[PDB]
């Protein structure tokens, strides 16, 4: 498959990339990802699908991932959005921005369930193909 | 655009109902719909829209596993939850269901009516 990631924090964007390599190899299914913390570069991958891992509080701007999530939802209606953030209280807010948020996963949690809740977000996708 | 409603409660399945007609008229939009209180015949309608309740008939978390069914047969679809269960809002993510909204039903008819327009106008924009 192929994954698009929006994380401007390296520590937080390298934690994920390790999880994805574990899962792909543990599950024996390929995975390719692109990663950035540059919004306009991210949109270059939509300007000219399918699984999207988005952070929210980006570059001093909280609720930025929400904004880009709308943008993605515009270009691809049936795209998959997964929210990853340290901002707990945004679990409610995903509805406001009218995004079909498959998942909203907190990052301030133990490494073990962390890797698990991602497999779900991928078992979902393979099934959807 | 057709609408599918899943509410077991009469005084609540008509609150939303009349709103649909208003909007349908107020914004001049054709809105067709069929509503039921039982899950079993809801499946017939499948196997645009969904307004599933959750704590359906004495058993909570039911509307969740129904939307999960809709999602399998209809991945394309738009799903809206409407409950008094204001603590299930964080749950929707768990049931692998990409819902559009989650409406705490126990709100005033002013704000309540508003909230439904978003979903309808969303669909309107999505077609």
mmCIF file of C-alpha atoms in Angstrom:
data_model
loop_
_atom_site.group_PDB
_atom_site.id
_atom_site.type_symbol
_atom_site.label_atom_id
_atom_site.label_comp_id
_atom_site.label_asym_id
_atom_site.label_seq_id
_atom_site.Cartn_x
_atom_site.Cartn_y
_atom_site.Cartn_z
ATOM 1 C CA UNK A 1 0.000 0.000 0.000
ATOM 2 C CA UNK A 2 0.990 3.654 0.471
ATOM 3 C CA UNK A 3 0.716 6.022 3.441
ATOM 4 C CA UNK A 4 0.799 9.819 3.846
ATOM 5 C CA UNK A 5 1.911 11.357 7.156
ATOM 6 C CA UNK A 6 1.707 14.843 8.670
ATOM 7 C CA UNK A 7 3.991 15.237 11.696
ATOM 8 C CA UNK A 8 6.239 18.244 12.318
ATOM 9 C CA UNK A 9 7.768 16.521 15.346
ATOM 10 C CA UNK A 10 10.641 14.191 14.472
ATOM 11 C CA UNK A 11 10.504 12.160 17.691
ATOM 12 C CA UNK A 12 6.795 11.682 17.030
ATOM 13 C CA UNK A 13 7.207 11.060 13.296
ATOM 14 C CA UNK A 14 9.944 8.473 13.742
ATOM 15 C CA UNK A 15 8.044 6.546 16.407
ATOM 16 C CA UNK A 16 5.290 5.901 13.876
ATOM 17 C CA UNK A 17 7.593 4.945 11.015
ATOM 18 C CA UNK A 18 9.087 2.270 13.229
ATOM 19 C CA UNK A 19 5.619 0.901 14.058
ATOM 20 C CA UNK A 20 4.768 0.712 10.350
ATOM 21 C CA UNK A 21 7.896 -1.317 9.606
ATOM 22 C CA UNK A 22 7.177 -3.688 12.449
ATOM 23 C CA UNK A 23 3.590 -4.224 11.319
ATOM 24 C CA UNK A 24 4.272 -4.567 7.591
ATOM 25 C CA UNK A 25 6.980 -7.144 8.266
ATOM 26 C CA UNK A 26 5.109 -8.839 11.135
ATOM 27 C CA UNK A 27 2.028 -9.015 8.884
ATOM 28 C CA UNK A 28 4.018 -9.749 5.704
ATOM 29 C CA UNK A 29 2.298 -6.996 3.717
ATOM 30 C CA UNK A 30 4.147 -4.147 1.947
ATOM 31 C CA UNK A 31 3.942 -0.519 3.128
ATOM 32 C CA UNK A 32 5.310 2.690 1.603
ATOM 33 C CA UNK A 33 5.156 6.065 3.341
ATOM 34 C CA UNK A 34 5.887 9.734 2.747
ATOM 35 C CA UNK A 35 6.410 12.013 5.748
ATOM 36 C CA UNK A 36 6.607 15.754 6.416
ATOM 37 C CA UNK A 37 5.777 18.693 8.658
ATOM 38 C CA UNK A 38 5.457 21.015 5.684
ATOM 39 C CA UNK A 39 1.772 21.602 4.927
ATOM 40 C CA UNK A 40 2.219 22.855 1.364
ATOM 41 C CA UNK A 41 4.544 19.948 0.575
ATOM 42 C CA UNK A 42 1.898 17.598 1.955
ATOM 43 C CA UNK A 43 -0.691 19.104 -0.373
ATOM 44 C CA UNK A 44 1.725 18.584 -3.270
ATOM 45 C CA UNK A 45 0.768 14.951 -2.741
ATOM 46 C CA UNK A 46 -2.852 15.922 -3.387
ATOM 47 C CA UNK A 47 -2.524 18.954 -5.697
ATOM 48 C CA UNK A 48 -1.258 17.215 -8.827
ATOM 49 C CA UNK A 49 -5.089 8.519 -1.272
ATOM 50 C CA UNK A 50 -5.532 6.559 0.836
ATOM 51 C CA UNK A 51 -4.483 6.261 4.489
ATOM 52 C CA UNK A 52 -3.720 9.593 6.128
ATOM 53 C CA UNK A 53 -2.090 10.009 9.529
ATOM 54 C CA UNK A 54 -2.616 13.595 10.633
ATOM 55 C CA UNK A 55 -1.402 15.629 13.582
ATOM 56 C CA UNK A 56 -3.600 18.530 14.676
ATOM 57 C CA UNK A 57 -1.726 21.136 16.727
ATOM 58 C CA UNK A 58 0.802 21.957 14.013
ATOM 59 C CA UNK A 59 3.372 24.774 14.024
ATOM 60 C CA UNK A 60 1.858 26.762 16.889
ATOM 61 C CA UNK A 61 -1.493 26.354 15.163
ATOM 62 C CA UNK A 62 -3.817 23.997 16.993
ATOM 63 C CA UNK A 63 -6.570 22.566 14.798
ATOM 64 C CA UNK A 64 -4.456 22.643 11.646
ATOM 65 C CA UNK A 65 -4.758 18.939 10.955
ATOM 66 C CA UNK A 66 -8.506 19.505 11.031
ATOM 67 C CA UNK A 67 -8.129 22.061 8.256
ATOM 68 C CA UNK A 68 -5.988 19.872 6.024
ATOM 69 C CA UNK A 69 -8.350 16.980 6.794
ATOM 70 C CA UNK A 70 -11.168 18.930 5.198
ATOM 71 C CA UNK A 71 -8.937 19.605 2.204
ATOM 72 C CA UNK A 72 -8.174 15.912 1.780
ATOM 73 C CA UNK A 73 -11.876 15.128 2.177
ATOM 74 C CA UNK A 74 -12.567 17.524 -0.695
ATOM 75 C CA UNK A 75 -10.061 16.045 -3.143
ATOM 76 C CA UNK A 76 -10.811 12.460 -2.161
ATOM 77 C CA UNK A 77 -14.305 11.890 -0.712
ATOM 78 C CA UNK A 78 -13.608 8.248 0.069
ATOM 79 C CA UNK A 79 -10.187 8.649 1.652
ATOM 80 C CA UNK A 80 -9.194 7.333 5.073
ATOM 81 C CA UNK A 81 -8.247 9.775 7.823
ATOM 82 C CA UNK A 82 -6.602 8.776 11.099
ATOM 83 C CA UNK A 83 -5.837 11.437 13.704
ATOM 84 C CA UNK A 84 -2.750 11.157 15.885
ATOM 85 C CA UNK A 85 -2.176 13.813 18.526
ATOM 86 C CA UNK A 86 -1.280 14.686 22.107
ATOM 87 C CA UNK A 87 -4.366 16.899 22.212
ATOM 88 C CA UNK A 88 -6.871 14.705 24.033
ATOM 89 C CA UNK A 89 -9.876 17.033 24.041
ATOM 90 C CA UNK A 90 -10.074 17.061 20.240
ATOM 91 C CA UNK A 91 -11.628 13.584 20.247
ATOM 92 C CA UNK A 92 -14.994 15.340 20.333
ATOM 93 C CA UNK A 93 -14.074 17.993 17.799
ATOM 94 C CA UNK A 94 -13.467 15.779 14.754
ATOM 95 C CA UNK A 95 -17.195 15.921 14.014
ATOM 96 C CA UNK A 96 -17.274 19.714 13.687
ATOM 97 C CA UNK A 97 -14.855 19.745 10.764
ATOM 98 C CA UNK A 98 -17.054 17.177 9.007
ATOM 99 C CA UNK A 99 -14.328 14.601 8.471
ATOM 100 C CA UNK A 100 -15.041 10.880 8.298
ATOM 101 C CA UNK A 101 -12.346 10.247 10.900
ATOM 102 C CA UNK A 102 -11.831 6.486 11.000
ATOM 103 C CA UNK A 103 -9.654 6.781 14.105
ATOM 104 C CA UNK A 104 -8.375 9.251 16.704
ATOM 105 C CA UNK A 105 -5.369 7.890 18.580
ATOM 106 C CA UNK A 106 -3.618 9.608 21.490
ATOM 107 C CA UNK A 107 0.188 9.641 21.334
ATOM 108 C CA UNK A 108 0.803 9.991 25.071
ATOM 109 C CA UNK A 109 0.095 6.281 25.646
ATOM 110 C CA UNK A 110 2.081 3.077 26.090
ATOM 111 C CA UNK A 111 4.048 1.717 23.117
ATOM 112 C CA UNK A 112 2.181 -1.611 23.046
ATOM 113 C CA UNK A 113 -1.458 -0.647 22.437
ATOM 114 C CA UNK A 114 -0.033 2.049 20.186
ATOM 115 C CA UNK A 115 1.296 -0.498 17.685
ATOM 116 C CA UNK A 116 -1.985 -2.417 17.962
ATOM 117 C CA UNK A 117 -4.423 0.427 17.256
ATOM 118 C CA UNK A 118 -2.539 1.012 14.019
ATOM 119 C CA UNK A 119 -2.859 -2.568 12.771
ATOM 120 C CA UNK A 120 -6.601 -2.006 13.107
ATOM 121 C CA UNK A 121 -6.322 1.083 10.916
ATOM 122 C CA UNK A 122 -4.566 -1.171 8.395
ATOM 123 C CA UNK A 123 -6.598 -4.367 8.737
ATOM 124 C CA UNK A 124 -9.408 -1.992 7.881
ATOM 125 C CA UNK A 125 -7.679 -0.855 4.701
ATOM 126 C CA UNK A 126 -6.589 -4.269 3.338
ATOM 127 C CA UNK A 127 -10.168 -5.463 3.847
ATOM 128 C CA UNK A 128 -11.324 -2.360 1.961
ATOM 129 C CA UNK A 129 -9.294 -3.558 -1.020
ATOM 130 C CA UNK B 1 -31.784 12.264 -1.668
ATOM 131 C CA UNK B 2 -33.065 9.382 0.470
ATOM 132 C CA UNK B 3 -32.628 9.263 4.256
ATOM 133 C CA UNK B 4 -32.599 6.247 6.586
ATOM 134 C CA UNK B 5 -33.555 6.707 10.240
ATOM 135 C CA UNK B 6 -33.148 4.239 13.111
ATOM 136 C CA UNK B 7 -35.006 5.359 16.234
ATOM 137 C CA UNK B 8 -37.069 3.209 18.597
ATOM 138 C CA UNK B 9 -38.588 6.237 20.316
ATOM 139 C CA UNK B 10 -41.645 7.971 18.824
ATOM 140 C CA UNK B 11 -41.383 11.450 20.370
ATOM 141 C CA UNK B 12 -37.771 11.554 19.173
ATOM 142 C CA UNK B 13 -38.224 10.024 15.726
ATOM 143 C CA UNK B 14 -40.733 12.750 14.899
ATOM 144 C CA UNK B 15 -38.675 15.621 16.324
ATOM 145 C CA UNK B 16 -36.026 14.906 13.710
ATOM 146 C CA UNK B 17 -38.682 13.970 11.209
ATOM 147 C CA UNK B 18 -40.416 17.358 11.023
ATOM 148 C CA UNK B 19 -37.042 19.059 10.818
ATOM 149 C CA UNK B 20 -36.277 17.091 7.651
ATOM 150 C CA UNK B 21 -39.397 18.465 5.970
ATOM 151 C CA UNK B 22 -38.621 22.048 7.010
ATOM 152 C CA UNK B 23 -35.086 21.906 5.650
ATOM 153 C CA UNK B 24 -36.374 20.061 2.586
ATOM 154 C CA UNK B 25 -38.649 23.026 1.996
ATOM 155 C CA UNK B 26 -36.755 25.912 3.609
ATOM 156 C CA UNK B 27 -33.782 25.127 1.373
ATOM 157 C CA UNK B 28 -35.953 23.649 -1.393
ATOM 158 C CA UNK B 29 -34.370 20.191 -1.363
ATOM 159 C CA UNK B 30 -36.137 16.908 -2.172
ATOM 160 C CA UNK B 31 -35.792 14.705 0.913
ATOM 161 C CA UNK B 32 -37.218 11.186 0.861
ATOM 162 C CA UNK B 33 -37.056 8.915 3.901
ATOM 163 C CA UNK B 34 -38.290 5.818 5.690
ATOM 164 C CA UNK B 35 -38.017 5.284 9.438
ATOM 165 C CA UNK B 36 -38.262 2.203 11.665
ATOM 166 C CA UNK B 37 -37.833 1.202 15.300
ATOM 167 C CA UNK B 38 -36.753 -2.366 14.677
ATOM 168 C CA UNK B 39 -33.294 -3.401 13.504
ATOM 169 C CA UNK B 40 -34.348 -6.506 11.576
ATOM 170 C CA UNK B 41 -36.277 -4.739 8.792
ATOM 171 C CA UNK B 42 -33.614 -2.031 8.585
ATOM 172 C CA UNK B 43 -31.321 -4.662 7.049
ATOM 173 C CA UNK B 44 -33.807 -5.216 4.213
ATOM 174 C CA UNK B 45 -33.324 -1.642 3.053
ATOM 175 C CA UNK B 46 -29.682 -2.501 2.317
ATOM 176 C CA UNK B 47 -28.808 -6.170 1.832
ATOM 177 C CA UNK B 48 -27.349 8.320 0.957
ATOM 178 C CA UNK B 49 -27.883 9.003 4.656
ATOM 179 C CA UNK B 50 -28.214 7.253 8.023
ATOM 180 C CA UNK B 51 -29.434 8.561 11.366
ATOM 181 C CA UNK B 52 -28.819 5.625 13.718
ATOM 182 C CA UNK B 53 -29.579 5.917 17.432
ATOM 183 C CA UNK B 54 -27.447 3.850 19.823
ATOM 184 C CA UNK B 55 -29.151 2.835 23.066
ATOM 185 C CA UNK B 56 -31.823 1.127 20.970
ATOM 186 C CA UNK B 57 -34.513 -0.770 22.894
ATOM 187 C CA UNK B 58 -33.086 -1.223 26.388
ATOM 188 C CA UNK B 59 -29.707 -2.267 25.006
ATOM 189 C CA UNK B 60 -26.965 0.328 24.557
ATOM 190 C CA UNK B 61 -24.194 0.203 21.939
ATOM 191 C CA UNK B 62 -26.617 -1.416 19.477
ATOM 192 C CA UNK B 63 -26.664 1.424 16.966
ATOM 193 C CA UNK B 64 -22.891 1.103 16.781
ATOM 194 C CA UNK B 65 -22.872 -2.507 15.571
ATOM 195 C CA UNK B 66 -25.619 -1.661 13.107
ATOM 196 C CA UNK B 67 -23.594 1.114 11.536
ATOM 197 C CA UNK B 68 -20.775 -1.427 11.407
ATOM 198 C CA UNK B 69 -23.042 -3.564 9.227
ATOM 199 C CA UNK B 70 -23.965 -0.652 6.983
ATOM 200 C CA UNK B 71 -20.264 0.129 6.610
ATOM 201 C CA UNK B 72 -19.556 -3.372 5.285
ATOM 202 C CA UNK B 73 -22.321 -3.319 2.672
ATOM 203 C CA UNK B 74 -22.111 0.432 2.143
ATOM 204 C CA UNK B 75 -18.553 1.764 2.512
ATOM 205 C CA UNK B 76 -19.517 4.859 0.532
ATOM 206 C CA UNK B 77 -22.184 5.918 3.006
ATOM 207 C CA UNK B 78 -22.648 8.833 5.407
ATOM 208 C CA UNK B 79 -23.457 7.962 9.022
ATOM 209 C CA UNK B 80 -24.906 10.140 11.793
ATOM 210 C CA UNK B 81 -25.459 9.103 15.418
ATOM 211 C CA UNK B 82 -28.067 10.749 17.669
ATOM 212 C CA UNK B 83 -28.247 9.800 21.344
ATOM 213 C CA UNK B 84 -28.776 10.888 24.906
ATOM 214 C CA UNK B 85 -25.653 8.791 25.459
ATOM 215 C CA UNK B 86 -23.220 11.713 25.580
ATOM 216 C CA UNK B 87 -20.387 9.444 26.730
ATOM 217 C CA UNK B 88 -20.266 7.266 23.614
ATOM 218 C CA UNK B 89 -18.795 10.124 21.584
ATOM 219 C CA UNK B 90 -15.243 8.870 22.030
ATOM 220 C CA UNK B 91 -16.362 5.323 21.203
ATOM 221 C CA UNK B 92 -17.314 5.720 17.538
ATOM 222 C CA UNK B 93 -13.655 5.418 16.543
ATOM 223 C CA UNK B 94 -13.470 1.959 18.106
ATOM 224 C CA UNK B 95 -16.158 0.340 15.949
ATOM 225 C CA UNK B 96 -14.143 0.944 12.758
ATOM 226 C CA UNK B 97 -16.975 3.200 11.622
ATOM 227 C CA UNK B 98 -16.190 6.483 9.921
ATOM 228 C CA UNK B 99 -19.211 8.398 11.198
ATOM 229 C CA UNK B 100 -19.775 11.966 10.049
ATOM 230 C CA UNK B 101 -21.334 13.342 13.226
ATOM 231 C CA UNK B 102 -22.487 12.535 16.755
ATOM 232 C CA UNK B 103 -25.452 14.534 18.040
ATOM 233 C CA UNK B 104 -26.359 14.675 21.720
ATOM 234 C CA UNK B 105 -30.118 14.582 21.153
ATOM 235 C CA UNK B 106 -31.002 16.162 24.485
ATOM 236 C CA UNK B 107 -30.394 19.687 23.224
ATOM 237 C CA UNK B 108 -32.717 22.568 22.339
ATOM 238 C CA UNK B 109 -34.612 22.421 19.045
ATOM 239 C CA UNK B 110 -32.834 25.549 17.829
ATOM 240 C CA UNK B 111 -29.309 24.111 17.995
ATOM 241 C CA UNK B 112 -30.592 20.604 17.251
ATOM 242 C CA UNK B 113 -32.183 21.601 13.937
ATOM 243 C CA UNK B 114 -28.994 23.449 12.985
ATOM 244 C CA UNK B 115 -26.831 20.375 13.526
ATOM 245 C CA UNK B 116 -28.809 18.341 10.995
ATOM 246 C CA UNK B 117 -28.322 20.912 8.244
ATOM 247 C CA UNK B 118 -24.559 20.375 8.355
ATOM 248 C CA UNK B 119 -24.989 16.689 7.581
ATOM 249 C CA UNK B 120 -27.588 17.308 4.881
ATOM 250 C CA UNK B 121 -25.653 20.168 3.292
ATOM 251 C CA UNK B 122 -22.574 17.943 3.483
ATOM 252 C CA UNK B 123 -24.329 15.270 1.422
ATOM 253 C CA UNK B 124 -25.698 17.997 -0.849
ATOM 254 C CA UNK B 125 -22.115 19.121 -1.433
ATOM 255 C CA UNK B 126 -20.879 15.539 -1.831
ATOM 256 C CA UNK B 127 -23.222 14.710 -4.709
#
